[PDB]
Ligand binder design. Sequence first.
Ligand SMILES: Cc1ncc(C[n+]2csc(CCOP(=O)(O)OP(=O)(O)O)c2C)c(N)n1
Ligand SMILES: Cc1ncc(C[n+]2csc(CCOP(=O)(O)OP(=O)(O)O)c2C)c(N)n1
Ligand SMILES: O=C[C@H](O)[C@H](O)[C@H](O)COP(=O)(O)O
Ligand SMILES: O=P(O)(O)OC[C@H]1O[C@@H](O)[C@H](O)[C@@H]1O
Ligand SMILES: [Ca+2]
Ligand SMILES: [Ca+2]
Lengths: 663, 666
Amino acid sequence: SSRKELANAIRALSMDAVQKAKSGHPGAPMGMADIAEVLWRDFLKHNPQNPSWADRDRFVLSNGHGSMLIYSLLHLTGYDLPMEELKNFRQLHSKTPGHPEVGYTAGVETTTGPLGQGIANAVGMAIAEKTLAAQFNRPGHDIVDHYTYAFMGDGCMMEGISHEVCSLAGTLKLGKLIAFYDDNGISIDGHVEGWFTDDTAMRFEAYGWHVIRDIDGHDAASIKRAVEEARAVTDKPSLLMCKTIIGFGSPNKAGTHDSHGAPLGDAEIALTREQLGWKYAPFEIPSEIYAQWDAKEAGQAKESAWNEKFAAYAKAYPQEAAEFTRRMKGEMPSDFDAKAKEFIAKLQANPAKIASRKASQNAIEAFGPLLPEFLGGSADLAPSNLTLWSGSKAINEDAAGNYIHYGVREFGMTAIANGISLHGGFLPYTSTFLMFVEYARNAVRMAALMKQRQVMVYTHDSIGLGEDGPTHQPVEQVASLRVTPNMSTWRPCDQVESAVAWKYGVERQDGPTALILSRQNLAQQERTEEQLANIARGGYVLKDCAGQPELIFIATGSEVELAVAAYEKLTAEGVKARVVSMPSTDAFDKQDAAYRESVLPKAVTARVAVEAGIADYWYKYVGLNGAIVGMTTFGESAPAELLFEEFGFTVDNVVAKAKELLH
Amino acid sequence: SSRKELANAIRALSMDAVQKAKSGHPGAPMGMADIAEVLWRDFLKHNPQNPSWADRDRFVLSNGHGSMLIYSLLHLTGYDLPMEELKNFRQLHSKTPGHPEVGYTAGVETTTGPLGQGIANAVGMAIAEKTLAAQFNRPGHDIVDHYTYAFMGDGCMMEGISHEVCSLAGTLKLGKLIAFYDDNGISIDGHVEGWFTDDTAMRFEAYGWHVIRDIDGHDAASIKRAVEEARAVTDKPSLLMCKTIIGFGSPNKAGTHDSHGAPLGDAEIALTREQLGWKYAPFEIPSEIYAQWDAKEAGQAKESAWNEKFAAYAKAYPQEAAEFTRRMKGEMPSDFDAKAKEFIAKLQANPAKIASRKASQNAIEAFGPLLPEFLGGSADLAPSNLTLWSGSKAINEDAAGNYIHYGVREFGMTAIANGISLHGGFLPYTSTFLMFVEYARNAVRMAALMKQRQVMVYTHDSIGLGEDGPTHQPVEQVASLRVTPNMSTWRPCDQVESAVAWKYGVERQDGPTALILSRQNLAQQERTEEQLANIARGGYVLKDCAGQPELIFIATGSEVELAVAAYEKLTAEGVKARVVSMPSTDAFDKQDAAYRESVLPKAVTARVAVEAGIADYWYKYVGLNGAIVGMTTFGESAPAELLFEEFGFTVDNVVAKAKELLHHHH
Ligand SMILES: Cc1ncc(C[n+]2csc(CCOP(=O)(O)OP(=O)(O)O)c2C)c(N)n1
Ligand SMILES: Cc1ncc(C[n+]2csc(CCOP(=O)(O)OP(=O)(O)O)c2C)c(N)n1
Ligand SMILES: O=C[C@H](O)[C@H](O)[C@H](O)COP(=O)(O)O
Ligand SMILES: O=P(O)(O)OC[C@H]1O[C@@H](O)[C@H](O)[C@@H]1O
Ligand SMILES: [Ca+2]
Ligand SMILES: [Ca+2]
């Protein structure tokens, strides 16, 4: 069959599946089908039989609304995505959700839909490949060698996050990253010139990208030549400016916003078949077209050749090969648990009053020699977030390193890290001041949604940071993280809880972990063996009374010391008081009901929460008959000590609020 | 004095103020002092005696960590910011907080600190001036004519938001926007080349900006020539690449990251005085230097000339002048309250089962003729968010318009809108799908912090949007807004609550208002006159029983219909039930104790929250002995009706959970 006929199979499947669902986006799949046909059939190195092959090229659909494009590709090339799944596009529990999702659909590399994040993820995957290659490749043994291809549209180009990650991609000279820009001149509001006039090629040249202008996105020869040129440029990421017609094939909707985001309609589909000369019924693909699209045979040949290469590598470099396999699988070193526990025990036995940001650095230092998979960084706050350890090596200086200077790019940093986690081989950590999680907020959510392991190191967690004032002092940010599905959030009260939280973070297999860390010094709490072990349970009894408590303080982070001081005062008066330290609400919630009852007995309603963050969160644990010593306002610019006093984080106020309950 | 001496006054006040506070950022003020001296002394049109003068130039410090730069400028030029306040830099309740804050420091135009948002605000202020000029200027009466100047550094340049707002500023050909880039090669991690290598000039040329390269940021003549060039270019915003030395003056810390964000140290300050030839003690400025810095006489002259111009305008165009004054003050039309109430009453009397996104569009259509100050827009979702009304006119088409195609730029859009509200003359509304509030999240917080009036139109509020699936379906986003200080958040249950929320939003002078709106059709509820009035109280009794309820449903938005259905089932079975509609938790919380007690009596503990959003939020109103019919997971890609079924948003399930609750209580 002709290349245009092969590409037209994508057009037919896409418009038909959208029509059947009465929902979806036929424009981009129709506009990009010719580009996809060249990339997938001529260049993409992949095995449909094993979507997890370590050395496969990675493809990313950043314009993820065009989900039928990727489903057509996966089906046609022989992945485990039958026609019935395409016929169930956008239907409950199908393998063909409205935007592509990593994890159930074979071959989908990442979850897109939020514009701009796909390209960010791609930048992360290219960073991972370059770094893994530098770490593992040996003379005569290039076991890591793959491209990262991304499709993206006007929406991704307009988003700020594209500037963050494409800027950094240029700095890092990501020669194996190749992006195709679907330059179709249309967005939802109509012709883009009213709101988007960038000389996008010039913009990308400013980033140090290799840019190929004026590609006819509907001509196989033009596209193929451009990809060849891009692959020949090894020291710069490449952008291919692909001029396309959105909804290509539709006489009445091609080139219009009408084709973007709704079914074409039965009549228009009939006209499209006529224009394309496509003779097949909906969901009919002839054997000749499958024969030219199918990649099972080539895929298995390529992967088997790689397996043989890896076997030879394992002979010459057995320890390295074992590390590669362990790291690609995301498995932890077998003695990590024992070694981390030893560190935790040492801290408990050797008290230090330090900021939890420093306790965090200390955990990185302890874990560093144990976790060569670390690929960490900070958004231009290394000396403040304390993300460097003695073994940190910046990848802009040493390609085989383990540290990234992300610059002032919180959103890009976090979505890049999502790419890194998705790639395999690494354990990313990222960092900024907690307030600026708000800049990265949707990428944090995406890590949770995609069930990705990433440790998010968020320092300067409250009014305790002092003089920088209300634009920097978090109040409501922790609460937002706590109510995020599949997020783990830890606000350690001292260096011991900080190490436990770090351990929990690196050992998570199925989601991210945010560490909520102080600028200011935190007192260490004394713990029994049982209490020490129970830190990992997220909430535990820190100070207690004999028999049923009359009063329970629930405190986190920097406020545990305050709660303990109130407890001592009330205990001396003869109140049966308890202090619960609650470093992680999510880990506590996951405990069995007997454990939860032992910490927060259901019959004890006199509960006082204490946390320098938004009060409203705490009704979850204090109910309607408790008290909350929290924040209800923005902060103020002043020294920390005076702020805590001003906002009622005092022994007198905590005691007074508790006494109010006991009547 | 020489220009360098005058600029050194800023250097001295800045390093000394930071030293006394033992906290702050001397680097940027010291690096940008010569630029500030030229801009402020030679170009800036302002009156220190009236920081609210309608036609003043606007200045924005986007690299807001260098706060002592602006405090030095305001003090030296004669604003109401005494030396005692500079001595109280970074101290509780001073007029000199660590990052500048609009509101309680004379002459500060916006609150910065979050990098990138300053330049966004500046773009908003420039859009406001251009639009206001187009709307109000008349032949021989150019009553609107001022520049917007912004300072920004490497941090602002790296941030994605700079791309969003500078791209759009290029499209809109904002000839009176002039930005100065503090090109000093240093950020917190060190020399920027390790992580920041853009050809920034080429980037801004790609945006359609006029760029002036290689300006010696420490040479007044060079700076002045560059400003004159930027002012001569009337059809593009300008970027002046100013090469500076961070911490200029410090022998040991200039040009180093060490000067960025900590006090220089007393020894180093002594050496800096010696290098700069600055002889005066900390917080000492001689009369002769004040005489050269002071702007009171020039300022008064310029404002008086403008007042004469405005008086002539008022004579020739009295209605237009009255509108200009009203709009600059942010006052509402005198008949707006009455007309809006008439609209609301009409809706209650004429039920329509429509999506609250459509109800929102209908309110825009009703208010549009009444509020010529509207400057609304959507981030490339006009046909989905339903932000256009019949009188909308895009400002890229007609500069005198009232609508902005923001493109796919949620964060930039919202921070631009903050600039628009800060400028005066307009009432901005912005819009995207609720999920993508997460892209704009800190700009939303900044509107709340800055006490700004902006209506935020957030559609597609839940799993009710259907097939687009979990990357689009909000779950936890409403809760996030509800816990934000000074945020108002409305999740209207029908077209009537939608109109009330819109009225509340436009009339809210001291903070923003987010509207949480459905894709799918919402049932109109029956209301008495009293209930209709009570919508604005945020939470109110919608359905009730005789005597103390044994069960209270609390519901919002699309789920009120479900709660009412459950209430009907239970009532028919002889259960004593109540339904509370809670369109706004923040408004409800602001009601007095007696009113809140009347709605959610403390005696009644069997409370069931119903909302297609994260369940954990609702413990606030249901306590530990209630029930919550909410979401606890991400969504799924499927038709909305199947999703509501899947996730337990059914009459049978709500009734079952309510009965299960009552069984446990009994
Ligand atoms: C962050 C974000 N904002 C908004 C949307 C809604 N949206 C989806 S596509 C689009 C604009 C059109 O973008 P483009 O890539 O040019 O679409 P195409 O040409 O492929 O049809 C928008 C606003 C989104 N998915 N993500
Ligand atoms: C959104 C955001 N992220 C991080 C910070 C912390 N921060 C303040 S300045 C800076 C980097 C230095 O930027 P630059 O403007 O080049 O500083 P300068 O040369 O004026 O000292 C950072 C990361 C912030 N204020 N806002
Ligand atoms: O992500 C935005 C998509 O393009 C929309 O899913 C699509 O345009 C449908 O819009 P609506 O929800 O108004 O039917
Ligand atoms: O002392 P910390 O809080 O680490 O940092 C002080 C300031 O220096 C930089 O980090 C930032 O600019 C911050 O505002
Ligand atoms: Ca497009
Ligand atoms: Ca800098």
